[PDB]
Ligand binder design. Structure first.
Ligand SMILES: CC(C)(C)c1ccc(N(C(=O)c2c[nH]cn2)[C@@H](C(=O)NC2CCCCC2)c2cccnc2)cc1
Ligand SMILES: [Cl-]
Ligand SMILES: [Cl-]
Ligand code: NA
Ligand code: NA
Lengths: 306, 305
């Protein structure tokens, strides 16, 4: 019993974090096999952060213009290339701690663990979600660039996020490990701003199922809803639309608890209308939307507390 | 910017987790140098658990009653003993991944990271606090016994919790790594319950300072108060008394933000008396009390390990 924001154990990723320095700029890189991945804006000078031409900036660099430090060891850079917004530095030593890994590009609503790092050294681990507006609500200070997000289902590290920058509302933007940004953002100092964000409806429903599994039913009601009437109501509270794909994804949780998906939708509609009247759900006084259906099945018992 | 519930990186601890089996019971152990630590109730049958004589159950046991598995390798047990509620199994191999470490017993209100494990395999990491009633609000399923809690200082892991049991309200109880229970609990199947809990006042103040650092200011006001007057409000709302030592600890945050502890105490007093008026603080509709002052400074300054 209990229910917590639960990250993956971070050791497999800790063994890959290094420090990358170019000029006066230092940030983090990810060392896998004989390649170090980092944000290409490590080659941006202070003079001009507004309109960098990264092709022109990089052709001026020699391999020895990049200093890579793994703990106390300097790694020798022997080649470099740019892929989208990520710089790939070839080094002369393969990382002996390289885990089984893959690169995955995730969809909004998906969650992952973040290992926040400074100067190549890990500071802490937390859970995040890719918001509908393609930002993440991270906790990142100056120098956190190059920190990564990941999942480790079944002993394989799936890297899905590399941190690049902070937006004006204090939320965060970055890329996949192929260097393609999530959302419309660019690695320039522009007036760019996150769009209006929305609540991840399928995740709220998963978390309501988690509450039932852990023994609390107070928020249920005698009603049901059509999918279209649910979406017409939920969107008035700035909730994302619920699709038939989402309904299908919630099937296993519905089967374990005996609560039909559209009956749980009716409960959510009433919670939005009424609030909690001084009660809490899984320790929260707000509706939580950064646990996915997969996350709830991972964390919760397979046996409902009836 | 941003503010998240944040755990320590868990790698140094992952390399110490093993699986311990005695009879039909399997749970987790902590392998440091040539000793594995686990809950002593691993030696109990369900019958034994109703009224166990641990002294007699252990003398019955021998080294060959224990199976220790590190990944796919069996560790050979060459000795066994008990310290309080912790079983110690001497093995023939020192753990080559043993970190610099200490065993530390924490105080109520202090936080720590938990590495939840099953069958000797780490499964997840989360942050939690020792409650004033000496429980923790963990997330644990069957087989999680022997999972540990810890803090890190530079390169040294301070182990502070080993998980033993779940109470009827679904909160959790355990020991320090010397086998001494936190709270008035015993490792036996008998009627036991969490006592009435209170809110950790110094941690709520720390989190209000974190909120100010992150730009959330609507709860600040022109008033100040005194320790004595604030503590009358605290008692009324089942908050822990605020001591002069707590005020000293908050000093830094008070100097940085511009709000004296007693100034911020006046904000908390008003929040307790009037509520939040439909507003949130750092994305919560409740007053959060599982961040210590040290947690707030660490996260807001980027301390690494
Ligand atoms: C060159 C470019 C692309 C404009 C840039 C510059 C600085 C950084 N930031 C580095 O901290 C940093 C950079 N190199 C080492 N550290 C930080 C950052 O985004 N401030 C922004 C301030 C507003 C204008 C855009 C940049 C940062 C802070 C906190 C958390 N995350 C990141 C990120 C990107
Ligand atoms: Cl996805
Ligand atoms: Cl006994
Ligand atoms: Na030792
Ligand atoms: Na005040």
């Amino acid at each position: 019993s209990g229910f917590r924001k639960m990250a993956f154990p971070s050791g497999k990723v800790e063994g890959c974090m290094v420090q990358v320095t170019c000029g006066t700029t230092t940030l983090n890189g990810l060392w896998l096999d004989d390649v170090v991945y980092c944000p290409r804006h490590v080659i941006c000078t202070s003079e001009d952060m507004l309109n960098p031409n990264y092709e022109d900036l990089l052709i001026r660099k020699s391999n020895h213009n990049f200093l890579v430090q793994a703990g106390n060891v300097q790694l020798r850079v022997i080649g470099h290339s740019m892929q989208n917004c990520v710089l790939k530095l070839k080094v002369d030593t393969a990382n002996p701690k390289t885990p089984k890994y893959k690169f995955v590009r995730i969809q909004p609503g998906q969650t992952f663990s973040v290992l926040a790092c400074y100067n190549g050294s890990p500071s802490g681990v937390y859970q995040c979600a890719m918001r509908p507006n393609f930002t993440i609500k991270g906790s990142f200070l100056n120098g956190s660039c190059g920190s990564v997000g990941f999942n480790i289902d079944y002993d394989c590290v799936s890297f899905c996020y590399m941190h690049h920058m902070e937006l004006p509302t204090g939320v965060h933007a970055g890329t996949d490990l192929e260097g393609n940004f999530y959302g419309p953002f660019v690695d320039r100092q522009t007036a760019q701003a996150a769009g209006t964000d929305t609540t991840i409806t399928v995740n709220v429903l998963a978390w309501l199922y988690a509450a039932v599994i852990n023994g609390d039913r107070w928020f249920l009601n005698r009603f049901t809803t059509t999918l279209n009437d649910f979406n017409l109501v939920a969107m008035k509270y700035n909730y994302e639309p619920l699709t038939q794909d989402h309904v299908d994804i919630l099937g296993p949780l519905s089967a374990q608890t005996g609560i039909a998906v559209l009956d749980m939708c009716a409960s959510l509609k009433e919670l939005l209308q009424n609030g909690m009247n001084g009660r809490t759900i899984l320790g929260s006084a707000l509706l939580e939307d950064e646990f996915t259906p997969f996350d709830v099945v991972r964390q919760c018992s397979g046996v409902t507390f009836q």
